[model samples]
Target chain A: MFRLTRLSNKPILSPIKEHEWEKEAVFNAAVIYEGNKFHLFYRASNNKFVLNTEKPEEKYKFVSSIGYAVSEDGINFERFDKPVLVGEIPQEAWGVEDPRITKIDNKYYMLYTGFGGRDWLDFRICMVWSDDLKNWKGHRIVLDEPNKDAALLSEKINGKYVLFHRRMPDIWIAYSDDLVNWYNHKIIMSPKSHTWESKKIGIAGPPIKREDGWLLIYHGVDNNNVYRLGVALLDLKDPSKVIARQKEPILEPELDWEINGLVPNVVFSCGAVEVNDMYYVYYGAADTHIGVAVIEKEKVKF
Target chain B: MFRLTRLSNKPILSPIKEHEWEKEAVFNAAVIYEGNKFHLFYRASNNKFVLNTEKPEEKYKFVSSIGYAVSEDGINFERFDKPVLVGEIPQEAWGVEDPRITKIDNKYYMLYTGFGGRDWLDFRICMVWSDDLKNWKGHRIVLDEPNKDAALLSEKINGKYVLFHRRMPDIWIAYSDDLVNWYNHKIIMSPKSHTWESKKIGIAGPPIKREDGWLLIYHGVDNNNVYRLGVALLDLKDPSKVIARQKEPILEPELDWEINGLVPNVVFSCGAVEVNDMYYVYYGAADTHIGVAVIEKEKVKF
Candidate 1:
């Protein structure tokens, strides 16, 4: 039920009117392919519209930052000039959108989201690290609630560690062992009634471990908030269990730049990378651009 | 901004129906009044609804506990058939509810909230003591990240030890030097964006000293999570500054016994004290009964 293959009809990253914090777009990237190159990472917003008075309802002032890019052949990239994380504290002031990388033991953490300010949707679940995945710069341990579609799960599973957030319409799971003092939580999946994810679901990217399990890839909204993409297959020793998912929507909201910009019909993704036998993924369109798709490893199906 | 008097007769304490654990609710109490009278320390919960196929939406199975009671004329009483605190570990296995108290140096300290069962609503905070006040056991220090409405602060200020608590929708203010390790956190209020303490506030009780400052009394939360009670003053030589605050809401949730039971509105308080010239306070009426109001030593404004 989860298959993909869109390889590109444009948008390997877009909106570039001389940066101004991304002239209003760029999506949730993250990728990781090592030395042969392809180490992306993204999130670049900036609504900058117009309006100003002390408070006129709402018009502009969005922010979002976190960019950086590089690639060799998995689709042209090479961006990075300013942003490798921005929004400086107040819990990501207004937006620090998703990134999702994972490398455990050998360092490299990065699981993101921080958007604060008068409860900017209560999104937090921040953490950053790096020995050199493009300097993610310190600042760690935060889950201060109103969460977001976090990631983490590249290693530790029998010895503690395991995050996988998102808490509006369910999809939870915490647990920690050392740094980040999480101590346990549950609910790994909720929101499912009539279908198309009935409205709410998260965690898209950074999960893939395969030997017949743990393949995650999430994102789902429907109930008019559109947004799509699905895939599950958990239980690699009860990764919160759920043995199969994706009843429909292996990806949706297609083209026209995925139903228009800055949050409209969304398509989120915190990352995905597999290479040699194909996989890629990387998403976020309608939070404005940045797309990529693929799967073929001989159309693997669990 | 803050006023109180109510004491004609109404909800002095309810839920006792033949003790199956304080019947079904006992409400947040936490009083003080030293040896010749009052003592209190409430919270009972046990509406134990049911359903369990593996948490099928968990109907009910609460379990809070901490009981004790004494009175004499602060409104007559004398009880304690059990529970001076329950939830034996695993950081309170599903209940310990709110209660704040402070004494320091004559050693009393109480501070509560624990409620766990997989971080249910993520309560945490826990600390206990008793230089003689019905013996509240120990195993304290836990601001272990996800905090709750804490209390501490009956003395030290330029020599450290403050701790207010909440750290969520604001309130914060930590620091300590032994006896609850906490090490730092700032923001002392923040939430007022629009009124009724607009959403999230904490530390209602334990902070009374006053020469022209430091009266406090908190607990807010709106945007429909109701729960009221305000008043502030702070700054007794900078208790994290904040000098006025009142601007509306001194205590709310008009009666029907503070509007129906177990969390329906909510009059939340934790303990006030003073006596002789009268101050009293001590609330928690709609989380199912136990009230008290007073205030007047020339109105006590701060």
Candidate 2:
């Protein structure tokens, strides 16, 4: 006789009201809080613009860039005039998406998935570190192909910094004494058979440690490629040990923007924040707009 | 490429071993910090205990109760010898489960679902208030019939106390000036036509208001009847205004305990607490054991 409730809040943040680059897209957003402002780094893909191009190659030219926005409070944000992290690198020539930010000591690290070609073939995990949020240095290829979403643990675990990444349909873990050197990779968890996440699963936001265990908000894809979010609890000392996993998805695509958009049924995240015992999860919906969900701190456990 | 890390702190809490009722099963737990100790109320069901054959027709043959446990720290709990709440009424003769505890103005309120008879036909939401953790009074039926999971908002919103409740397969809301008189019932959210939560959705814990909005952790069911936890954000002033919804579930069933036990593919909750910037969610897995997950306060948005 367990009962559940849904928050009345929805579409906490969406794509630009009117923008040429992001007119038809806003997906895979990464949010970070600085002082009283929230900095969001998101990926926007204009499929309509690409399809309207004259050249056939242009139709397949899906250009995605990480744009920045600031919110005085964590909800309403004002986008920057220009994109924060953009460009076509050899590794990420096709697109750069799903950025996860982690702050360690005084340094801020940005981890994102990179696509080499248009088809997401050669998907790699890349890393960038910064002393300050704006000025970033040390761009390197942390993980090669077969890896997708990689979120770093904010602090050290057993004297080593820990990382959670996705290898195809499963979630894996790695450790690093320094952010530059990572090793001891292990497959921590995966989607169960005959379940909603039977198709694929990946990490959503960075992990947070509690008295119980490591709390992880993750995304899962069904056979249809429709994505949703779920939670997992891991052993605080040995993350490889999973304490509990959600049998069902906590959030899913329902709104018009989430159901009818560039990519249907996709809820992706780059960041989450907690204020006054509530967790605010900012996510991208249907690869078109930003959405949000919150939970009480006590309601989640390991 | 967001890299995830597991904390060194592991095995936050284990199932209570002393109690014969919960020795075999314990799940969907609620935790509240009362003074220096953490008061935990959890759903416990035992299948191994063979009932006396003389009373085979008795509906109360199966043992189900809301057990109590206390911890000085958030973890490491000590189970009480007796249950805090048990099924006595005809409507709840089967069980009382999934308690969501909230302290408003120093008074603690516990909201839970009640199962009626052995047919598993009647499921309703019940409420109780307490001044001290040990003694609880004001037992009343907050929601009946078509409602099951319900979590009360910590405080009143616009002169009314808001509640997150489930109206079978969807999440709904209601307002009450006093704890007993509820009205203005409305649907806040529902499962999508085709997505992770295509089947049902409900609330996991009480709403925790932050600077941004009300943070709620909710659960959803896919077409497969698999349950998972998701997140949503609600407006502080107007509880009906959906601020943001997670495009994904915060948790899903993946472990053996969550997949193979009684009522497989379930990770249910009614409690979450905040310490510093971390949120700890405690849940039941497959109706067999209690587990937890964590989320960072800063990672969540308003």
Candidate 3:
């Protein structure tokens, strides 16, 4: 019974032609609702070209940044002129993409991929924190490895900060006494072969705590490279244990917007929030624009 | 030119037919030269079968344990009655293999692979400590991931403990404040395609400090799965920096023992020690027996 209904026919946020930083695409948005206002941070790209300094003969490039926006009704948003986060450091020389935000004790911690490398593309999990959402600071490369798709739980699990990141085909969990240093890496889940997640699986957002357990919305890719959204319930006592998971994906690439774009046949999510008995799930359609899907809280079953 | 000459025509250690624990093979020995004595810890296994409790239909099985031995001339050794380490805990339910020993402040720290899993095999880097050398204690699964071939540097690099491990095809370096918690993992070396190391590469033993830098011994596998030993010099200040590496392998499988055994065409090392201006490299030959190869310190060049 895990069905999500699209809030509108068109995307909630799309690339602006005048804004060069977001002219090509604006997707994978991270949203947080505070004081009746929706704060969104989205991955944006210019679709421009630059010299591959490491390999001058190489031909592909797409640099990204994190754009800021705000909405009073969680649908109509007013975007900012400049991006809140950009590829300024050497570690993030390639770009910063897929921001997953989690707030804990008045501080907003943003975990994003600091994409950069010399000869090859390296995906490192980076972190940035801000007391005021508008002025982001405290940049640190948390996981310095060829990895991506990371999210931090808002609350501490058993008094230790827990993080979920993909090392390769498996989604792994790591523990840290302090958020800066991480250790105790172990695989929590893997792609089930001959299914929608035959290729790979990654966390879509931080797990939403409920009475049953941690309601986790994750993305899975099949052999054909089609991305779909699935649900998993992790044990409340030990978040590493996946108590239950949906055999079928709840949200797959169906609509024209999700089936066609720069990256075709994809519906990847980064953020979701619960409001007034409904859960608002924000997903990127084909890595192009952002769309919102809603499902009544009562509809979700373990 | 880093050329190693075999100490003897026969292996220093072989399987004991009477001992069920080491009846199948004894190989991949870790050695340390201390007080005119050579302390050796080799991986041993029995050629026996047990019910695949996890998967009853499985057809293959081999469980390993760590055996202790001591030598006066670094050749002939007096074996102990039982193994120093075994498959005792749940994390190491399957077996413990390939022990790498490093000594600091009169205490010996050993890192080996804790091989175990359900429905699939899992390789986790585990650590055990010893003070009296006879009785080993303090067992901990340091890197709780499917990883193997790890060695800890005897001396700290820049006040932080440094470790070399293989995540996959590449050999990676990680740093730690305390031995229990590790972080800052990055790739230090990778296999070169179309070369002897085209398949995969892993660390043989902890780096041996030299005037130029840290001399590292590692193993490489060709596409055909033939294993060979290679050498590389890392920067003294930053062990992660592979300043220079030998284009050709220093040592390779050649003897009859190396050509045929449980695992054929392999010469893998877990320990090397410097004594009397010579480096004694002890390795497992075809996963069957332990052999010693020696290289004059003056013959080694970066």
Best by lDDT: 3
Query: What are the DockQ scores of the candidates, in order?
Result: 0.02, 0.01, 0.01
lDDT of each: 0.76, 0.73, 0.85
TM-score of each candidate structure, all chains considered together: 0.34, 0.48, 0.55
Tens-digit lDDT string for candidate 1 (B25-132): 887778888876888888887763221223312224577787888887877677868878787765576668777878788878787888666634556788888788
Which has the better DockQ: candidate 1, or candidate 2?
A: 1
lDDT: worst 10-residue window of model 1 chain B: B49-58
TM-score (chain A) of candidate 3?
Answer: 0.94
The first chain of model 1 has a TM-score of 0.33
Name the candidate, 1 or 3, with the larger TM-score value: 3
lDDT by residue (tens digit), candidate 1, A1-302: 55777788778888787878888788878777888888878888767423234432234457778788888987888886788778675657776778788888777888777765543343567888887786667776456545777888888888878888865777877656654645345667777878888878887877887777888888888798888888887888768777877687777777888887656777777888887877888888877888888887556575
TM-score of chain B of each: 0.33, 0.88, 0.94
Interface root-mean-square deviation, each candidate? 13.4, 19.2, 16.3
Candidate 1 chain B TM? 0.33
Encode model 2's per-residue lDDT on B1-302: one tens digit a residue.
11111121232343456775666677788888657666789888754323334433454355668888877756677877778888767877767878888888878888887766444335678888888766888888885343677888888777778788876666878776667755556678888868888888888888777888888788888888898888888887887777888887777777777786767898777888877777777777777777777777887753
Superior candidate under lDDT, 1 versus 2: 1
Please report the TM-score between candidate 1 and the true structure.
0.34
Top model number, TM-score: 3
* Candidate 3 residue-wise lDDT, B96-135, digit = tens: 9899998866888899998764434356788888887767
Of the two candidates 2 and 3, the one with more favorable lDDT, higher being better, is: 3
